């Protein structure tokens, strides 16, 4: 297919050092995953970058979602438009270790991926969410059964994830 340049980790998990925004713009996947919070406030990290690329359309849509449905749960998700990036955006809430949220909910977060055949995704709970990215990758591999293309922005982290993989 249209995903190019990925390293194969397992039958179904692939990884690349790339900016998820640029990779979504190039591939136009059916599903891109956002590293959301429960309020769908897309201020920083992956979420802030994805929202900026939609010219704030993602935030306007998300505010309407919250006004109608209320917050998500940690570990939960919702499917909204992908705007100019993808057909759909799967907004998934991983635990934020800096807020004291239970890291076990990371498995529940990744289970949402199994409802979609192919996804372009970041590592959940990494970056500003405070979890160890090596652990997040392990939970991903052990939980997701569908085809997941992981984009890791930081080259030094990418190299560490690949070279420590087991």
From Swiss-Prot:
Places the protein is found: Host endoplasmic reticulum membrane
- What is the activity-regulation note? Inhibited in vitro by GRL-0617.
Residues in Macro domain copies: 1-166
Catalyses which reaction?
Thiol-dependent hydrolysis of ester, thioester, amide, peptide and isopeptide bonds formed by the C-terminal Gly of ubiquitin (a 76-residue protein attached to proteins as an intracellular targeting signal)
Membrane topology per record: Multi-pass membrane protein
What role does it play? Answer: Responsible for the cleavages located at the N-terminus of the replicase polyprotein. Participates together with nsp4 in the assembly of virally-induced cytoplasmic double-membrane vesicles necessary for viral replication. Antagonizes innate immune induction of type I interferon by blocking the phosphorylation, dimerization and subsequent nuclear translocation of host IRF3. Also prevents host NF-kappa-B signaling. In addition, PL-PRO possesses a deubiquitinating/deISGylating activity and processes both 'Lys-48'- and 'Lys-63'-linked polyubiquitin chains from cellular substrates.
Q: How does it assemble?
A: May form homohexamers. Interacts with N protein.
Task: Give the protein's recorded name.
Answer: Papain-like protease nsp3
The organism that produces this protein has a lineage beginning with: Viruses, Riboviria, Orthornavirae, Pisuviricota, Pisoniviricetes
First and last residue shown, out of the full length, are 1026 to 1191 of 7096
